[PDB]
């Protein structure tokens, strides 16, 4: 069997990213110093640029828009995009999203290959995927594995998580590179892995294309992913969490904190209040509720239904803008 056609289709849109730091060269005893004049000197230089390759990026448009993990580009002095055909351009950061580990880069180049997108919702466990990237500085490498699992939350890496799990070897430097389907269609961005050694052990994770896209579209539109805020600290009601709180068998979210002067504080949410309904949606599961509020447009008046001391309270809050971490 072969995936070479998919490799041909997909590899040209997977660029490699790097940063440069000018640095002090190892000194010599008989050579001129900035402060001392010795026996000899150098012809044209006094410092040396070092390339420090960050990870992989994915081209999403012929306009020049690039997707990458935020951590690849974090605290970067200079981001150089190295194309598969040997081209090099200086990238402009457009925006970053620390909550979803995503950053968007802009490149001014003609003749840019773009990545043909595929639906991440249509993937299944047991599907074949190929991970394209730049592991350990070796060069463009393509790896193969199946989709080990889908939609992985509870990983505790990001505020918002919808992770594909992969069997294809992902290594340091593979971050920001593409996860593709067997036909060469982008289904994810390589983001993080679980390892004792630091090398791929068969547990890689990538951000699905649907989530990656929403944030990319938002970052291009505003330069910030806009998210909703309720200023609530929420815990799940377990059988012993309920007993400490004094509710014998109640289930669902309970608030354990109110962000000072946030939308809940003005609205009336109080610690110990079981949330029944957020904006006419039943708040049964916390992850569903947080994402709902996240997509709720800031400056909107939604109605929170709460259970306080066994009685229902119809609270009203003005959804705010989620602050950065």
């Amino acid at each position: 069997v072969s995936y070479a056609n998919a490799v041909s289709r997909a590899a040209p849109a997977v660029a490699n990213l790097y940063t440069t730091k000018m640095v002090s060269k190892p000194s010599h005893p008989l050579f001129d110093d900035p402060m001392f004049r010795r026996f000899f000197g150098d012809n044209l230089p006094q410092q040396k640029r070092m390339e420090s390759s960050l990870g992989s990026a994915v081209i999403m448009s012929a306009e020049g828009y690039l997707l990458t993990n935020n951590h690849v580009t974090a605290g970067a002095d200079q981001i150089i995009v190295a194309l598969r055909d040997g081209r090099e351009t200086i990238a402009q950061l457009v925006g970053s999203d620390p909550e979803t580990d995503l950053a968007v880069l802009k490149i001014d180049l003609k003749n840019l290959p773009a990545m043909t997108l595929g639906r991440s919702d249509g993937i299944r466990t047991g599907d074949v995927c190929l991970a394209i990237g730049n592991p350990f500085g070796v060069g463009q490498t393509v790896t193969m594995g199946i989709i080990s699992a889908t939609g992985r939350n509870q990983l505790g890496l990001n505020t918002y998580e919808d992770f594909i799990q992969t069997d294809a070897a992902i290594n340091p430097g593979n971050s920001g590179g593409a996860l593709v389907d067997a036909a060469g269609n982008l289904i994810g961005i390589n983001t993080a892995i679980f390892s004792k050694s630091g090398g791929s052990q068969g547990i890689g994770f990538a951000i699905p294309t649907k989530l990656a896209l929403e944030v990319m579209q938002s970052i291009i539109e505003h330069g910030q992913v806009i998210r909703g805020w309720l200023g609530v600290e929420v815990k799940a009601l377990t059988p012993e969490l309920a007993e400490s709180l004094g509710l014998g068998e109640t289930a669902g979210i309970v608030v354990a904190g109110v962000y000072r002067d946030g939308p809940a504080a003005r609205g009336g949410l109080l610690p110990g209040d079981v949330i029944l309904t957020i904006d006419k949606q039943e708040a049964s599961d916390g992850r569903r509720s947080m994402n709902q509020v996240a997509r709720t447009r800031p400056g909107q008046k939604i109605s929170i239904v709460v259970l306080r001391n066994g009685q229902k309270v119809n609270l009203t809050a003005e959804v705010g803008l989620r602050p950065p971490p």
Partner: peptide, 6 residues
């Protein structure tokens, strides 16, 4: 601990 801040 299942906790969310939103």
């Amino acid at each position: 601990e299942l906790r969310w801040v939103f």
